[PDB]
Amino acid sequence: YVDVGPDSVKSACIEVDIQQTFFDKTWPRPIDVSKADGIIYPQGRTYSNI
Amino acid sequence: QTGFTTTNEAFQKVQDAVNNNAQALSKLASELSNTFGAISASIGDIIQRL
Amino acid sequence: LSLFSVNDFTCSQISPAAIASNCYSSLILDYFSYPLSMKSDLSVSSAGP
Amino acid sequence: LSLFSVNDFTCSQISPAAIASNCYSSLILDYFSYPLSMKSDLSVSSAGP
Amino acid sequence: YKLQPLTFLLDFSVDGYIRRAIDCGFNDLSQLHCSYESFDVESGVYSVS
Amino acid sequence: GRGVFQNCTAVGVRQQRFVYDAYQNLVGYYSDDGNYYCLRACVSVPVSVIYDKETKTHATLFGSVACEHISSTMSQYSRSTRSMLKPVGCVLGLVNSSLFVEDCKLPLGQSLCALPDTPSTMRLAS
Amino acid sequence: IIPGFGGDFNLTLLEPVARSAIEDLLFDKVTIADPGYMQGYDDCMQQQYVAGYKVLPPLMDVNMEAAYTSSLLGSIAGVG
């Protein structure tokens, strides 16, 4: 049910070069509960100062 | 007269008595209610949902 | 309900009358083909597989 | 189960999956000829002749 | 970061945003905060499971 | 749910239309879509039966204050004796019993409040 | 009760006239959990107790209670 964009027409796909070592950079960012990182709001209701 | 705060153990005992009556009365009844209700837990949805 | 005659109506955890007039967060509807022979087999929970 | 095709399989007070794969101290089984037309009589809740 | 079913003590401000939260399983202190339902608990020695 | 709305300061994220307070009971914030309006729980008046067996006279009592707002045989209050109901100086309640309370009277009597004392002859001793 | 009680024995328990200052201080210092006497229902309409339990009145006025303390304060010297 594809719509809007025409598909199945392309001469070729671009060549891709993969280097894992360059991508291997360490920048740790741990979840913090105090900062409420990645915490979904309760879908049921909003709350006051409680 | 100057010291009637946390330093005075007897004053803390008066606060404990006031806290005990309130927790045993308003807090206990409200928390116990809603706990035993599977659905609405207050009106009970007698005609609303049952 | 008027549009389709209901061969079997069973409502669980909700009143049959209540579903028509209750106000709630979202409505979920499902449709599938069911045999009359397996109408008895179909249940919210059943010993039968 | 493979030897005889089963018209119905019902387990009471035990899961069908559990009856196939559970540890039981003793197994007692009864085999007899029972007509398909009369299946209502053999029910613990019912009191058929 | 993967999501796991967890019980979290949640602090809601007057604005209603969740400024602070407690994991409740990360360490003994988080479990103590959940027990009293308060971010700050009285100083003392508390038994843990 | 029964609710009373009065102007209050806006609170909550506004993503959800309902604010709750640690219970199934609802604060009912923003009851009006246009402006924030805090909801109120159902409000009722308690009734206490003051009865003397020998006198065979019965009286009606209310809690904390009844003089300022509540009135006798009020339409708003549905249940009194569950059939029919049953004007005095403000005290612990608007007693149906009248006569009022004299400043000085015998201390001994039926228990009631800090100052009101219940006699038999309906009377309200102090 | 006399404003001068002791010879340089400054006594602050004097009642200002009932509600002695030391008694007032402890009541103020302790949380005012229940200001709902004499105004409970109006307060219920301004911000009768939830559903069921209804707090009953003390049965002694803080003035009569102060009068009992006043009698004790006067009696101190005579029994002494």
mmCIF file of N, CA and C in Angstrom, chain D residues 3 7 13-14 16 26:
data_model
loop_
_atom_site.group_PDB
_atom_site.id
_atom_site.type_symbol
_atom_site.label_atom_id
_atom_site.label_comp_id
_atom_site.label_asym_id
_atom_site.label_seq_id
_atom_site.Cartn_x
_atom_site.Cartn_y
_atom_site.Cartn_z
ATOM 1 N N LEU D 3 -2.668 -42.476 20.035
ATOM 2 C CA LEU D 3 -3.356 -43.753 19.693
ATOM 3 C C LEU D 3 -4.833 -43.507 19.366
ATOM 4 N N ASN D 7 -12.348 -36.733 21.138
ATOM 5 C CA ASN D 7 -13.530 -35.870 20.874
ATOM 6 C C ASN D 7 -13.417 -34.608 21.733
ATOM 7 N N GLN D 13 -9.103 -28.899 38.142
ATOM 8 C CA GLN D 13 -8.231 -28.777 39.347
ATOM 9 C C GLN D 13 -6.768 -28.970 38.933
ATOM 10 N N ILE D 14 -6.513 -29.120 37.629
ATOM 11 C CA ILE D 14 -5.118 -29.257 37.119
ATOM 12 C C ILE D 14 -5.054 -28.622 35.725
ATOM 13 N N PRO D 16 -4.085 -28.480 31.729
ATOM 14 C CA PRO D 16 -3.844 -29.503 30.705
ATOM 15 C C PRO D 16 -2.335 -29.597 30.436
ATOM 16 N N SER D 26 1.522 -40.764 42.324
ATOM 17 C CA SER D 26 0.841 -41.964 41.767
ATOM 18 C C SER D 26 -0.133 -41.561 40.655
#
